[PDB]
Design a protein around this nucleic acid. Structure first.
Ligand SMILES: [Mg+2]
Ligand SMILES: [Mg+2]
Lengths: 68, 55, 75, 145, 64, 189, 144, 57, 143
RNA sequence: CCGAUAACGAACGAGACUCUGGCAUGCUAACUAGUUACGCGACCCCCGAGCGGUCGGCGUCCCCCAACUUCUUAGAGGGACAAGUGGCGUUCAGCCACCCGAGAUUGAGCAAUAACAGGUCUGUGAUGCCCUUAGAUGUCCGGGGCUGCACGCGCGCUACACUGACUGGCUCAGCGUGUGCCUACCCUACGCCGGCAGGCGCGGGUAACCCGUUGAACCCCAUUCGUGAUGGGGAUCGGGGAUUGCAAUUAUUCCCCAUGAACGAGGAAUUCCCAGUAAGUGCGGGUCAUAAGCUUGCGUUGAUUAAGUCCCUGCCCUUUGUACACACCGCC
């Protein structure tokens, strides 16, 4: 156990989904590539944790509304 | 006081031969790498020297 | 569980008993035969290798910790 | 050839002034003498030029007398001086080895002359304490109580 | 008078019990008669799907 | 075919109870040439079952300090022990190993915490993983003390421990202890 | 039958024990540190060294010439590094010069026997802390 | 070089110099707005630049 | 069917070589062979009085496997555990005199020589007989 | 964190972060790391292997006289994210199982608001106040002492044995140190003498260049022992010899021959611990003129049991009571 995302990654993911919904997609690697340039994240570890949550929310939003 | 016995006893070696270069104490002295430093003094001056506790 | 007084060497009663009964049962080890015959066990090592040189038993393992022999195959 | 015990066997036999076992190996059995260890036993039987795989009860009479003269006169048979007990002795300055109660007599001699000269070591001996400078605050209480 | 020993197949693990987690309630149906299922309190690591021995039949499992 | 220790095929062995059939790793896909593989079988739950049982035997042999890492010694111990049993019984030593574990498996136990105020020892059943783990541990601890102060070798004393357990002659340490565990479970059922 | 420059070099390590196997075209033989696999120090694990050559038989070893240099670790770690080095070296040489279709039909047997024959163990060791004799063991504490 | 000292001892000696220099400058320019110091060492020369608030003092 | 010393069992090779040294009356031995122990950490002198032939066989192949090895290299190789009694055990190097005597005795037998640097290395005649005994011990062992 | 929700949005701490471990036959390169190829050899051969086998033998930056970074070093990057699948779950946060993968929880470092009259004036030319200050509690020298033992306690090491001890043989590491302002003190190869501790002369090294391919122990292979307080144990003690020091007695240490004490798995109790972990087993550093049973690291061999709970012990939150607020060591 212990795979809970922090509010830092959670909030940042919701922002970038709202501001760039079109450019994102269902692929994690594509998401971490677009997140590489649109936002300035210093850490790669933080970078792909954000993209991991974004790919998780992309599946949710394609089949139902979410909080964002 | 008289010259013959004021420094008659040698200290070429042992714990009294060595002292801290900041405070002249003779306990907990680090001699590695030519440091010659009282250990509490070394913990004080480590950052200026260049020692970093990476982990 | 008081004492063992294991025999350092053979005598009239044991030497013949070893030569007549040892190559008959399945497990022939210095430990087993020393328990059965109350012999020392350093004697058991010397006796078993002499029995092996006499052709009455066949070697199985030949290890430093334990050497194991067995009876000949009947035929 | 790994046969029975011989007729000329001693199950218990007397060497010097005390008894030594027979069922044990020759070198490891003669060490029962008060003054011979396993090194001394091996090096005198090697100079005695006899077997080492046979027990003490296999020691025929001429072997018995052979090895006792060796162990009583070691230096005369090219045993090195540094192998000995009483090397460069305090009485005669003569190398020798002490055996049986002869060890006990030389041991007693040192102890009584140490008390006689009133050295610190002898005083500790007399008081039943340690002599080699080891501490006594925590250990050794079994020897007193 | 002694009941025959048989086997029981684990369906699901109810949880832990015994005030230390040492025991484990489990729902088991006999393979002789798969209709009947009882709760038995096992000792040791049990997964779901594996089967286990039973020296008796009537005795169920209470708490602890 | 696989020939553990150069012989003793694992294709003709069977497990009589389905309780332990699904927890013994003597089968073909779990048949190893030697009882030595640092396969990380204790990293998570329910991995030790898929580890070969002979590997478990050598694991449970190294005990009590003086040999806690000497896997090479336990391998030659079970090697000579397999030879000894194969000599004096003739059948498959892996088969007699499986049978010995089956017999020594304690099918019931006590929880000892049945009642809070006063110790009650509620009688309970035993999971299969506990069945094998206790059975192998009883066999290895029986072998440990069967030759503590005697001439008998560790390989031989382990061998007769296995034989008596596999034949259910009740003179084995495992059979005595298992029976005792059953008796108390009957007593406080 | 005369094709030169047909060689690979594949390493393999476990617990700071690297073992580089050099593979090339040649008649079927095997040597580690200049001596055959049979003449090795832990002969109780000698079955594990010949275990890879027993899986796919000597026929897939008869057309190859492989020699291994080993450094580091202990006896067990060297042996394990060597046997995985052999499997990795043969499988890579086969993949390099002939079809991977037949490379698969030996790779599948290798992994389904023992994945460590092709995949190195990631575990090395844990550092010692200043609170006890070892990595996690702590010194005795006493209250009275 | 045998007349020379090991590089490890050299860096230690440098940090010893920097630490002592910093402490002496601190105790000397404590009232003069002392802030810090740096050294650039070259085979030709070694330079000491003292950073302070009131350089005219 | 050529055989190198590396291609036989070293346990059987060493005893074969020492028996050859026993037969060949050329190898000189000192007169203290029945007296001293082989190292500082040894509690007892070796059980074989032919230990000198055994050791000379050992150091023969040791200089075969790698050259440039001197006395301190030899005492390092033959060093072992020392119980230290109540103290925890340590590593004690072998005795210098026993290794020196072996090196100078093989020197006298003239199948080893001083290098351009320190240590000693085999002569061509040296490994000639070593590969000669390794082949014959291989042929006897294999059949 | 998700969720109900008079709250919404934040900030510290956790996280994030730095270092470290595993993977990249991807890039960058190396005579202070090397690897394949080749030329000489040396030996094995020759039954015939001959594109034969071994070489830590010599050379191919001896610079024109081969390539390359797989192995080593270390930079820049990548790589893992619960990402894919299935199941459970409010179907949310997540949990579990599996394929593929080097890795599906690597270890540390740092670390909140505050409190403990917690420990340190004997770390300091950090320090207030008091004491002493020439018959000195300043300071130096000499000797003794910090070790001293009717006893109790703690941390440990050595063992109680045959899963072993001894004898011999085979035999694989990784941390990391190494010649000094004061400061006279380094790691050491080889050769010779000595049984050993050691001694003598040449060397090398301020170091990926030398020690050093760190030929470590354990373990492995053979012989002996044989259940005997025994060849376990090496305590105690006698004699002798070397190293260091101005000095070895109250034994500095080390070496050899002696004697061989309790101890046969330890009561009530009690400590530490979940994967390269425990545990065995050595080796470095710090201490050092002399030196580790200590400590801190490193490596080797390497498991049993569990993926849970509040029963015990502690700790935290909520509720509750208060005559406490110097806050229960309280008030009275
Ligand atoms: Mg953090
Ligand atoms: Mg003695």
């Amino acid at each position: 156990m212990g795979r809970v995302r922090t509010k830092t990654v959670k909030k940042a993911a919701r922002v970038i989904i709202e501001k760039y919904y079109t450019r994102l997609g269902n692929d994690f690697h594509t998401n971490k590539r677009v997140c590489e340039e649109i936002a300035i994240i210093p850490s790669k570890k933080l970078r792909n944790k954000i993209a991991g949550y974004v790919t998780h929310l992309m599946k949710r939003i394609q089949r139902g509304p979410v909080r964002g | 006081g008289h010259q013959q016995l004021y420094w008659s006893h040698p200290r070429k070696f042992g714990q009294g031969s060595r002292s801290c270069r900041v405070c002249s104490n003779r306990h907990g002295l680090i001699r590695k790498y030519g440091l010659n430093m009282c250990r509490q003094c070394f913990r004080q001056y480590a950052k200026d020297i260049g020692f970093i506790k990476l982990d | 569980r008081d004492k063992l007084n294991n025999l350092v060497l053979f005598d009239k009663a044991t030497y013949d008993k070893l030569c007549k009964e040892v190559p008959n049962y399945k497990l022939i080890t210095p430990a087993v035969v020393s328990e059965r015959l109350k012999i020392r066990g350093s004697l058991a090592r010397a006796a078993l290798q002499e029995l092996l040189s006499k052709g009455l038993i066949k070697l199985v393992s030949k290890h430093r910790a334990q050497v194991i022999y067995t009876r000949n195959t009947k035929g | 050839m790994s046969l029975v015990i011989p007729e000329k066997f001693q199950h218990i036999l007397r060497v010097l002034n005390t008894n030594i076992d027979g069922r044990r190996k020759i070198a490891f059995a003669i060490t029962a003498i008060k003054g011979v260890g396993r090194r001394y036993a091996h090096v005198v039987l090697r100079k005695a030029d006899i077997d080492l795989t046979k027990r003490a009860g296999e020691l025929t009479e001429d072997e018995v007398e052979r090895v006792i003269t060796i162990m009583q006169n070691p230096r005369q048979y090219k045993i090195p001086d540094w192998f000995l007990n009483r090397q460069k002795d305090v009485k005669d300055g003569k190398y020798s080895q002490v055996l049986a109660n002869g060890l006990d007599n030389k041991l007693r001699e040192d102890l009584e002359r140490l008390k006689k000269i009133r050295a610190h070591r002898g005083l500790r001996h007399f008081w039943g304490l340690r002599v080699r400078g080891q501490h006594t605050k925590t250990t050794g209480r079994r020897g007193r109580t | 008078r002694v009941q025959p020993i048989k086997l029981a197949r684990v369906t699901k693990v109810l949880g832990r019990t015994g005030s230390q987690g040492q025991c484990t309630q489990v729902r088991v149906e006999f393979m002789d008669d798969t209709s009947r299922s009882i709760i038995r309190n096992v000792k040791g690591p049990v997964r779901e799907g594996d089967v286990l021995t039973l020296l008796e039949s009537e005795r169920e499992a209470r708490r602890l | 075919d696989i020939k553990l220790f150069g012989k003793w095929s694992t294709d003709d062995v069977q497990i009589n109870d389905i309780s332990l059939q699904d927890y013994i790793a003597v089968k073909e896909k779990y048949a190893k040439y030697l009882p030595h593989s640092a396969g990380r079988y204790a990293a998570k739950r329910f991995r030790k079952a898929q580890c070969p049982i002979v590997e478990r035997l050598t694991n449970s042999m190294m005990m009590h300090g003086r040999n806690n890492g000497k896997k090479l010694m336990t391998v030659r111990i079970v090697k000579h022990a397999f030879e000894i049993i194969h000599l004096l019984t003739g059948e498959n030593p892996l088969q007699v190993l499986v049978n010995a574990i089956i017999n020594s498996g304690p099918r019931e136990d006590s929880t000892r915490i049945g009642r809070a105020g006063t110790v009650r020892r509620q009688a309970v059943d035993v999971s299969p993983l506990r069945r094998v783990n206790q059975a192998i541990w009883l066999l290895c601890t029986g072998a440990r003390e069967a030759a503590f102060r005697n001439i008998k070798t560790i390989a031989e004393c382990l061998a007769d421990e296995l034989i008596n357990a596999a034949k259910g002659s009740s003179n084995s340490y495992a059979i005595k202890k298992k029976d005792e565990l059953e008796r108390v479970a009957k007593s406080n059922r | 039958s005369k094709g030169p420059l047909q060689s690979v070099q594949v390493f393999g390590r476990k617990k700071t024990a690297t073992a580089v196997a050099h593979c090339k075209r040649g008649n079927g033989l095997i040597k580690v540190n200049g001596r055959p696999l049979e003449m090795i120090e832990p002969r109780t694990l000698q079955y594990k060294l010949l275990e890879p050559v027993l899986l796919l038989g000597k026929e897939r070893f008869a057309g190859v010439d492989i020699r291994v240099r080993v450094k580091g670790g202990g006896h067990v770690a060297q042996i394990y590094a060597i046997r995985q080095s052999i499997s990795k070296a043969l499988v890579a040489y086969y993949q390099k010069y002939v079809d991977e279709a037949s490379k698969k039909e030996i790779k599948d047997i290798l992994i389904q026997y023992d994945r460590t024959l092709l995949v190195a163990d990631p575990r090395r060791c844990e550092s010692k802390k200043f609170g006890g004799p070892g990595a996690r063991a702590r010194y005795q504490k006493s209250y009275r | 070089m045998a007349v020379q000292i090991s590089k490890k001892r050299k860096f230690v000696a440098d940090g010893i110099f920097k630490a002592e220099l910093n402490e002496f400058l601190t105790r000397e320019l404590a009232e003069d707005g002392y802030s810090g110091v740096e050294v650039r060492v070259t085979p030709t020369r070694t330079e000491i630049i003292i950073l302070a608030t009131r350089t005219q003092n | 069917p050529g055989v190198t010393v590396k291609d036989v069992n070293q346990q059987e090779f060493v005893r074969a070589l020492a028996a050859f040294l026993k037969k060949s009356g050329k190898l000189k031995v000192p007169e203290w062979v029945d007296t001293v122990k082989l190292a500082k950490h040894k509690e007892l002198a070796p059980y074989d009085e032919n230990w000198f032939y055994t050791r000379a066989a050992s150091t023969a192949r040791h200089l075969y496997l790698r050259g440039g090895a001197g006395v301190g290299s030899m005492t390092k190789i033959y060093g072992g555990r020392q119980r230290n009694g109540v103290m925890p055990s340590h590593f004690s190097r072998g005795s210098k005199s026993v290794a020196r005597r072996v090196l100078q005795a093989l020197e006298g037998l003239k199948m080893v020589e001083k290098d351009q640097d320190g240590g000693r290395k085999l002569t061509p005649q040296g490994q000639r007989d070593l590969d000669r005994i390794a082949g014959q011990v291989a042929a006897a062992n294999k059949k």
